[PDB]
Amino acid sequence: GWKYFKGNFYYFSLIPKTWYSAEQFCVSRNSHLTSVTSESEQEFLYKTAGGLIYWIGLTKAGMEGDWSWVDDTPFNKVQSARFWIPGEPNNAGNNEHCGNIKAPSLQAWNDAPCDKTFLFICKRPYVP
Numbered sequence: 753g754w755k756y757f758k759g760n761f762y763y764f765s766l767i768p769k770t771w772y773s774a775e776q777f778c779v780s781r782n783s784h785l786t787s788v789t790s791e792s793e794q795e796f797l798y799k800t801a802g803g804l805i806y807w808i809g810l811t812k813a814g815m816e817g818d819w820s821w822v823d824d825t826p827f828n829k830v831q832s833a834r835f836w837i838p839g840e841p842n843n844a845g846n847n848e849h850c851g852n853i854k855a856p857s858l859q860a861w862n863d864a865p866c867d868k869t870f871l872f873i874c875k876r877p878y879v880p
C-alpha cells in the first residue's frame with residue numbers, strides 16, 4: 753500500500769490512531785510519521801489526503817514548546833511558516849501539542865490534541 757514520491761515511500765493509513773500510537777505503528781514498519789520539507793512534498797501529501805485529516809510527524813519539543821519532527825528532521829520555522837492553515841497553530845485549550853494535515857492547500861497544517869484519533873501518514877526512506 754506504500755506510495756512512492758521522491759526517494760521516499762508513504763503509507764496513508766486506513767485505521768485511525770492517536771498520534772503516538774500512530775508513530776509506534778510507523779516505527780514498527782521501519783518508518784516514522786512523515787516530515788514535510790518542501791512545497792512539492794506538502795502538495796503530494798495534501799493532494800493524496802483528498803480532504804481528510806491525517807496525523808503527520810509534527811509535535812512539540814523543548815521547554816519553549818517549539819515544533820519538531822518526530823523523524824528528527826530539524827524543524828525550520830521560517831521555511832515552514834507558509835504551511836500552516838491561517839490562524840494555526842492556535843494551541844486550542846492549551847492542549848494541541850501534535851500536528852496534522854487538514855486543509856487541501858499548501859496552507860494545510862493544524863495543531864490538535866495528541867490523544868485524538870485520526871488517520872496517519874508514515875514515511876520510509878527508499879535505500880537502493
Ligand SMILES: CC(=O)N[C@@H]1[C@@H](O)[C@H](O[C@@H]2O[C@H](COS(=O)(=O)O)[C@H](O)[C@H](O)[C@H]2O)[C@@H](CO)O[C@H]1O
Binds near residue numbers: 863864865
Ligand atoms: C472540548 C472541545 O471539544 N473543545 C473544542 C476544541 O476542540 C475546538 O478547538 C479547535 O479544535 C480544532 C480541532 O481540529 S482537528 O484537526 O479536527 O482536531 C482545531 O485545532 C482548531 O484550531 C481549534 O480551535 C474549539 C473550536 O472549535 O471548540 C472547543 O469546544
Ligand SMILES: [Ca+2]
Binds near residue numbers: 842843844848862864
Ligand atoms: Ca489548532
